[PDB]
Amino acid sequence: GLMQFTLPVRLCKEIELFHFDIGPFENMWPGIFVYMVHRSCGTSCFELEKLCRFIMSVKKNYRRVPYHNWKHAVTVAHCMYAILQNNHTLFTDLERKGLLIACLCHDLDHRGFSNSYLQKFDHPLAALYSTSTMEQHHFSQTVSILQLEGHNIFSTLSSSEYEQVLEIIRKAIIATDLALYFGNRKQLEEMYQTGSLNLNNQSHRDRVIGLMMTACDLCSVTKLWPVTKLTANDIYAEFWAEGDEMKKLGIQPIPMMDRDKKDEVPQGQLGFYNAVAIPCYTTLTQILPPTEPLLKACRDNLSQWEKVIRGEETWISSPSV
Ligand SMILES: Cn1cc(CNc2cc(OC[C@H]3C[C@@H]3c3ccccn3)nc3ccnn23)cn1
Ligand SMILES: [Mg+2]
Ligand SMILES: [Zn+2]
């Protein structure tokens, strides 16, 4: 069915924008990924049959959790697409191929639990992966799908190329562990301000790709306010379900995972934008100046959350609950 799809003409110009919301086009999501791949590395970068099998099996391996689901994978892949389009010659053909695939696969088989939850409650995944637990699992799941019959989209590559893509993918998925972001951004800020940042330097390149992954992972803060607000509802529905699990086990969750502490969400979002999102997009803009619309949109949403705290603004936009 995916092989048969044709993209509506109105979306041609829309899909190119950073603030584009995929939300209203659920039936078109696999096709939108195909179109993005074709615009990023050409119609003859992957065999259509293999790509469509890959996409559909990835979709199947995303659980029906409130936030880390199929919609999130495609949202993240679209932000990466827009980043790559606006800085096309900075990245190699191999990087473009790997990063779009890494974004689509970055939360594969997510169970709706944080790494701290899995580590604290001795889940088998935490026994197997000591650090970046879920992220190591997401990469493993990606490899398994590639290893399926008719799914190896990277078969036509040389081994120095295949091992190279699988490493670009591995590093990119691990980088989505938010615990790793803080040190990565601090490092890049230092390299930029001292003028030592060199994109020809592989260590430096891996760090920039890392920041790109964080920037894509949190891109809901870069959408129009009604979209940002609606995604925040999904993010907290997932945090609150994990908090509910801790409460059944007699443990008090931190306020961000406590549904009885909803009033702390606007202050919680202000803190997150100030300590996480704003520095992320600020650093990204400095390194890749065409990414400035993400920083601009993030600042607008920071102002909206400031208005919510001040009582100047109010979930879902509906006359009835
Ligand atoms: C579900 N999930 C999402 C992610 C990462 N992405 C993410 C997390 C996040 O955490 C906000 C809570 C820390 C704030 C808080 C502190 C105290 C009280 C209330 N809130 N906010 C946002 C906005 C856009 N993306 N995003 C990781 N698992
Ligand atoms: Mg993740
Ligand atoms: Zn994610």
DSSP string, 27-87: GGHHHHHHHHHHHHH-TTSS-HHHHHHHHHHHHHTS---SSSSHHHHHHHHHHHHHHHHHT
Cβ(280)–Cβ(178) below 8 Å: no
Mutate to test the pocket of ligand 1, among 76, 213, 223, 239 (most ligand atoms within 8 A of CB): 239
Report how far residue 101's alpha carbon sits from residue 108's, in angstroms, rounded to the nearest whole number. Answer: 11
Q: What is the DSSP letter of 277?
A: I
Task: Tell me the CA–centroid distance for residue 282 and ligand 2, in Å.
Answer: 21
Cβ(3)–Cβ(52) below 8 Å: yes
Q: What is the DSSP letter of 222?
A: G
Q: Would you say the CB of residue 235 lies under 6 angstroms from ligand 1?
A: yes
Block residue for tokens 């827009």? 82
Structure-block tokens of residue 165 = 């893509």
Domains defined along the chain, listed by start = 1-321 (1.10.1300.10)
Q: What are phi and psi of 239, to 5 degrees?
A: -60, -45
Q: Would you say the CB of residue 221 lies under 6 angstroms from ligand 1?
A: yes
Cβ(106)–Cβ(215) below 8 Å: no
Structure-block tokens of residue 219 = 């891109």
Task: Tell me the CA–centroid distance for residue 235 and ligand 1, in Å.
Answer: 6
Closest CA to 213 of 41, 34, 79, 15: 79
* Residue 232: C-alpha distances to residues 27, 64, 236, 265, 269 (Å): 23, 17, 6, 9, 9
Cβ(148)–Cβ(156) below 8 Å: no
Cβ(198)–Cβ(204) below 8 Å: yes
Report how far residue 292's alpha carbon sits from residue 281's, in angstroms, rounded to the nearest whole number. Answer: 8
Task: Tell me the CA–centroid distance for residue 176 and ligand 3, in Å.
Answer: 7
Q: Which positions ≥6 away from 3 have C-beta within 8 Å?
A: 48, 49, 52
Residue 68 among the catalytic residues: yes
Q: Would you say the CB of residue 129 lies under 6 angstroms from ligand 1?
A: no
- C-alpha neighbours within 13 Å on the C-beta side of residue 58: 31
Report how far residue 46's alpha carbon sits from residue 113's, in angstroms, rounded to the nearest whole number. Answer: 34
Structure-block tokens of residue 50 = 């293999």
* Residue 301: C-alpha distances to residues 34, 185, 226 (Å): 30, 21, 10
Cited resolution, angstroms: 2.0
Mutate to test the pocket of ligand 1, among 75, 218, 281 (most ligand atoms within 8 A of CB): 218
Amino acid code (one letter) for 320: S
Question: In this structure, which residue's CA is closest to atom 6 in ligand 1?
Answer: 218
Q: What are phi and psi of 201, to 5 degrees?
A: -80, 115
What was the elucidation method?
X-ray
Instruction: Report helix, strand or coil for 124.
Output: helix
Catalytic residue among 19, 38, 68, 204: 68
**Ligand lying nearest the CA atom of residue 263:** 1
Structure-block tokens of residue 127 = 């026994």
- C-alpha neighbours within 13 Å on the C-beta side of residue 132: 19
Amino acid code (one letter) for 56: M
